[PDB]
Each structure stands twice: as structure tokens, then as C-alpha cells.
């Protein structure tokens, strides 16, 4: 009955863990302690096979290690920065009145490393926006922002009041000072059945052809502007984009990243430094 | 049962697409590949008629190409600008304390081009207002705006505190700084059964008679004022009017606009420039 | 929260081998311990091997 699944869900008891059964001394030709790891299978041996156990009613649950629990938390994926101007000519320009950001999960290591535990992932994305407009003068002025999602092949804005900001077909969300953090869902939007966290392939046959997950699905661009025209007092605006996966599926688990990331969409790990090589978290003894 | 239509609606599976049936080699007097386009009908031939197909269970849906999906998105249709004054005499004047805008879908090309894919359209209009008041001095002051819809033949305001702003019969909406974006519906309001996107007709028989869709239905005027009397620090106010069609019907599809718009309610396309003629998006090779 | 793409139908979910539902499925797989972890071995496969001899 669905009420049992609801009660288990509010208790976080959906994913029950086996009890420890009582065991006793054994003298047998069966040797659970011995196996062949050469098979590629992990030994099935459990505590009851190798020590005399008591009965324990196991209270633990695995709900918080579900992939929905593990990946389904909001983390920063972009910091989008622009510095407004009192000059009408400069306020129209990129980096001043508006900024663009090529969408990916690749720029922030905390999120990137978690999703890269899997080869393929499929999820809907909850986006939440945290804007902080640092006043450089004696007043904030009126702060109204527009965030426009520009899909691949749609025209990207080149000016703060370009025709593209009309948003006649693109999704836009508006934010003004004192408004709660903007939030919207992007449904799972790949042309494939899952996102590639990794892709051992190319966009072509040639020396110049691109390699890796960047080939597989262009994710479009977030464009942000201040909607307000030029104002007396400048603002250093930073919009932080937070992403939570929802309705998550993940396939083909991978070793975690063991060394610093160097570049987006690349497994490259060799640093630029000539004295310092790539560093692991294995401590010597 | 209505629950099936609800489930299809939340999945976006209302408009199912045919499966590809399996096909085999054919040798016949029937020649699906041959037709007469002179008839004005498009050939009915499908992949199964011209290649050996496998069975494919087609997952695609047409929900997002519905006219409700295509036209039912908020796009900018006006930018209404006025610059407030600290001078009590100047703050009363048009362009300073208040502004008027003759209603149409004609001024912003992104919306205009989409609706002009059809000859006639019928919809209710959701209006949303995005106000950005750029502070020109050290403080915003108290910003309260009134947007008044003035139907055809109702008296248009000539002063910021004229009697017409009493709004005893006109619809007005008030906005103040920090208030969420104003929103209201205008029902389908033509004297005809649909809006004319195009009209091959005149308001009269004479050389001076107007031609085209401007004849067919005057849409009234949005009047915006700052309700606040004159204040110490000026504001460059821009109100952006966003329009979403709802409950949409559309008739008689048309070729899309292939060249820049030049004027409102006019199909005219010849630019003012003597070196540069009208430009298409057909690239040479 | 509202969808930014209001009629969008996601691409069909195909069967892909190796779905993971819980991280404990991954913890239940043996992985090698770098037991040797001396300064001479931590840049090499040798950190995973413990020496035995007469």
C-alpha cells in the first residue's frame, strides 16, 4: 500500500539493511574465507562465516547513499561576473552591462567530481540563482536582472539592449533586488538518452578534431544582463548558478578523480609547473 | 478518462507520432516514389515505401510544436521610456512624468515574425510588466507607477496628474519598488472573430485611405506615470511590456518574413540606404 | 519548480547496462589498498604490492 512507502520515506527507512544472524563455531571442508579474486568477483564472505556473531537487528538504512541523495543536492556550477558602468557607452558592453556563460557541469570541482563517479547520467536539473551586487558607490540604484537561456544555434546577445533580449522564444527569468532566489527546472535535454560524463570519441577523423565529452551535446549559454539602463553608482555583480539533479539515473561507475582538474571537458592532469608534478591525496609513510 | 489526458499532459505525450513499420523489398507497378507536384499536393510517400525499414517504436511527441507551445511564450512587445524631473513643471510633462504607447504586436521583430506565420490569430493575452528605474542621483526615492489601459475613444492623459488617471472606468494596475512583476490578462478583444496579422484592404476608397492591418482594430493605448510627485533625484524609467498568447487559434499559414521589417503594420521592405538593398538570409555559394 | 521548457519531451530512456542505484553497490566492490605507500612507490603500481620473502 502506498502509505507504507510514504511512512518509510518520512522515516528514511526505504532501503533496509540485513540483520546480523547469530553464528557458532564451524569445522568444515567449506572455506568461505578462501576465494579467487582472479575471477573479477568480490568475495561473498560475511561476518557470520568468519567469527561467532550474536543476533543484531540492524537499524541502518541506505537511503542517504542512494544516487538521488548523493547527486540530488544543490551545488555551485558557475560564477557569472559583470561590473556595471555610469557611462552609457560602456554600460552597453559585455563584461559591463551583461555577461554570457557556456553551460556545463565542468567548472566547479565539487560538483564535477561527484557526477564523474559515473560514465553516463540522466537527470532533470533544478537551477537556483544567487545574485550578489556589490555597491561600489553610495547607493545600489534599481537592480533588475534578466537571465536568458540561449539554446545552441540561437543568437547570443552582443549588447546589453540587443534585440535578442526580447526573449520571444528563449526562456528568460527576471530578478529584482529583494526578490527570493530565482528557481526553474531544465528537463533532461540531451539529443542522446543520457549525458556523457566521458566520451572516448571525436567530432571527426582529423588531427584538428575535438575529443571527449564536449563533442556529445552542446548545452547552450546563460546570458545575464542588468535590465536597468546606466546609473550613477557602479555595481560589481556576481550571479552564482546552483544546480541540483532530480529524477536521477546513473550508469557504469568509475574511479573518482585522484588528481586536480586542469581544464573543462578534459581528463588532462599534468600541471604547467616544472618543479611540481601532478599531486595525489595518497600520503607517504 | 480525464486522468489519461492529465498524465499525457505532464509527460508531454499528448501528440503521439506514428511508429516506423518494418518493410521489405518490393517489385511492383505501384511507384510511391513518383507523383505530380503540379497537383499542389505534397507526395504521401513515407520511408517504408522507399527503403527496407526496421520496426521502430517512435518516442517523439509534437506537443512543443503545438501553436499553444509556439506562440504561448512571453516576449517583449514594448519598451516605454520616461525620465523623471525634480522640477515640478517638467515632472508634469509627457516623456518626463508619464509616457503613452499605442498598443500593437508590431514593434518587436521576434514576437512579430512568429505571429505573422499566420494570417489570422485569436488568443487571450497575458501581459507581464518589467520595470527598471535607473537612479541618476544618490537615491531612488519612492517609486510608485500606474499603468492605465486607455481603450479607443477614451481620453488619453496630457499631464502626469490629469483627471484621466482617476481610472473610474479604465483598467489601471499599480506597481511599487520591490513589488513582483505586474501581471493581468486581456481577453481576445477584437470587434472581429480573429486579429488580422495582414489585411489586403483599406479604411476608404481614396488616395489618402490607410492600407493593411492597422485599419482592422484599434487596440488602445497603455499610459504609464510615476504616481509620486517631483523628487530630488531623477530616474530614467523603462517599462518593458511582455506578452504571452493563451487559448490560441491560428489560421492560414504564411511564408515567414524573409527580410528586415521597416515599419509597423506594413509589409514594406525596401530600406532607406542607396548602396545597400533589402537583405535575405540565403547565403551564396 | 516551473520548467523553463514547458512542452518539452525528453529523449527516450534506452536500456544501458551497469545502472547504479546506491553508492554502497560501489563500496561492495574490492579495490586495491596502496599498503606499501613509501616515497619510492606512491608514483607507481608498486604502492599496491606488499613484499613477502623467506
Amino acid at each position: 500500500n502506498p502509505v507504507e512507502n510514504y511512512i518509510d520515506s518520512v522515516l528514511n527507512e526505504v532501503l533496509v539493511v540485513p540483520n546480523i544472524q547469530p553464528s557458532t563455531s564451524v569445522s568444515s571442508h567449506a572455506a568461505p574465507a578462501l576465494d579467487a579474486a582472479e575471477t573479477g568477483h568480490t568475495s561473498s564472505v560475511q561476518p557470520e562465516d568468519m567469527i561467532e556473531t550474536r543476533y543484531v537487528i540492524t537499524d541502518q538504512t541506505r537511503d542517504e547513499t542512494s544516487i538521488e541523495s548523493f547527486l540530488g543536492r544543490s551545488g555551485c556550477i558557475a560564477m557569472i561576473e559583470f561590473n556595471t558602468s555610469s557611462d552609457k557607452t560602456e554600460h552597453d558592453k559585455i563584461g559591463k552591462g551583461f555577461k554570457t556563460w557556456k553551460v556545463s557541469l565542468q567548472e566547479m570541482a565539487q560538483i564535477r567530481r561527484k557526477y564523474e563517479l559515473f560514465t553516463y547520467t540522466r537527470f532533470d536539473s533544478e537551477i537556483t540563482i544567487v545574485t550578489a551586487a556589490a555597491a561600489q558607490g553610495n547607493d545600489s540604484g534599481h537592480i533588475v536582472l534578466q537571465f536568458m537561456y540561449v539554446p545552441p544555434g540561437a543568437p547570443v546577445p552582443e549588447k546589453r539592449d540587443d534585440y535578442t533580449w526580447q526573449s520571444g522564444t528563449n526562456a528568460s527569468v527576471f530578478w529584482q533586488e529583494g526578490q527570493p532566489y530565482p528557481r526553474f527546472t531544465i528537463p533532461f535535454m540531451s539529443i542522446a538518452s543520457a549525458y556523457y560524463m566521458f566520451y572516448d570519441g571525436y567530432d571527426g577523423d582529423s588531427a584538428a578534431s575535438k575529443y571527449g565529452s564536449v563533442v556529445t551535446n552542446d548545452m547552450g549559454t546563460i546570458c545575464v544582463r542588468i535590465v536597468t539602463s546606466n546609473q550613477k553608482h557602479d555595481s560589481n555583480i556576481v550571479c552564482r548558478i546552483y544546480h541540483k539533479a532530480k529524477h536521477i539515473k546513473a550508469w557504469c561507475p568509475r574511479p573518482p578523480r585522484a588528481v586536480a582538474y586542469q581544464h573543462t571537458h578534459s581528463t588532462n592532469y599534468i600541471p604547467s609547473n616544472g618543479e611540481a608534478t601532478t599531486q595525489i591525496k595518497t600520503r607517504p609513510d | 478518462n480525464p486522468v489519461e489526458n492529465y498524465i499525457d499532459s505532464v509527460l508531454n505525450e499528448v501528440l503521439v507520432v506514428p511508429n516506423i513499420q518494418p518493410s521489405t523489398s518490393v517489385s511492383s507497378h505501384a511507384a510511391p516514389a513518383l507523383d505530380a507536384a503540379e497537383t499542389g499536393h505534397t507526395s504521401s510517400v513515407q520511408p517504408e515505401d522507399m527503403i527496407e525499414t526496421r520496426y521502430v517504436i517512435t518516442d517523439q511527441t509534437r506537443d512543443e510544436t503545438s501553436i499553444e507551445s509556439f506562440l504561448g511564450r512571453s516576449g517583449c512587445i514594448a519598451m516605454i521610456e520616461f525620465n523623471t524631473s525634480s522640477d515640478k513643471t517638467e515632472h508634469d510633462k509627457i516623456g518626463k512624468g508619464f509616457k503613452t504607447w499605442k498598443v500593437s504586436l508590431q514593434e518587436m521583430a521576434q514576437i512579430r515574425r512568429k505571429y505573422e506565420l499566420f494570417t489570422y490569430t485569436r488568443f487571450d493575452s497575458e501581459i507581464t510588466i518589467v520595470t527598471a528605474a535607473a537612479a541618476q542621483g544618490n537615491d531612488s526615492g519612492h517609486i510608485v507607477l500606474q499603468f492605465m489601459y486607455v481603450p479607443p475613444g477614451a481620453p488619453v492623459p496630457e499631464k502626469r496628474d490629469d483627471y484621466t488617471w482617476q481610472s473610474g472606468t479604465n483598467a489601471s494596475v499599480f506597481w511599487q519598488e520591490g513589488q513582483p512583476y505586474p501581471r493581468f490578462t486581456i481577453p481576445f478583444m477584437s470587434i472581429a472573430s480573429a486579429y488580422y496579422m495582414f489585411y489586403d484592404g483599406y479604411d476608404g476608397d481614396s488616395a489618402a485611405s490607410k492600407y493593411g492591418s492597422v485599419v482592422t482594430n484599434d487596440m488602445g493605448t497603455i499610459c504609464v506615470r510615476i504616481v509620486t510627485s517631483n523628487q530630488k533625484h531623477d530616474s530614467n524609467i523603462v517599462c518593458r511590456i511582455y506578452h504571452k498568447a493563451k487559448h490560441i487559434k491560428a489560421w492560414c499559414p504564411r511564408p515567414p518574413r524573409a527580410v528586415a521589417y521597416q515599419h509597423t503594420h506594413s509589409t514594406n521592405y525596401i530600406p532607406s540606404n542607396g548602396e545597400a538593398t533589402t537583405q535575405i538570409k540565403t547565403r551564396p555559394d | 519548480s516551473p520548467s523553463a521548457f514547458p512542452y518539452f519531451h525528453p529523449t527516450k530512456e534506452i536500456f544501458i547496462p551497469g545502472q547504479v542505484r546506491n553508492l554502497i553497490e560501489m563500496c561492495q566492490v574490492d579495490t586495491l589498498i596502496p599498503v606499501n605507500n613509501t616515497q619510492e612507490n606512491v608514483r607507481s603500481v608498486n604502492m599496491y604490492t606488499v613484499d613477502l620473502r623467506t
Binding site: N5, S9, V14, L15, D63, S66, E68, G72, D124, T185, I186, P187, F188, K246, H247, I248 | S9, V10, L11, N12 | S1, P2, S3, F5, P6, F8, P10, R21
Partner: peptide
């Protein structure tokens, strides 16, 4: 569980499996 929006993607976290 009440769903306020017309899209499946708009719903909160899915049930565990």
C-alpha cells in the same frame, strides 16, 4: 503527492529504488 506544474520534470526528488 500534489503536483503544481504541468511537466513531470517540475516534480521534487523521485522515490528511492
Amino acid at each position: 503527492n500534489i503536483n503544481y506544474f504541468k511537466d513531470a520534470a517540475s516534480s521534487g526528488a523521485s522515490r528511492l529504488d
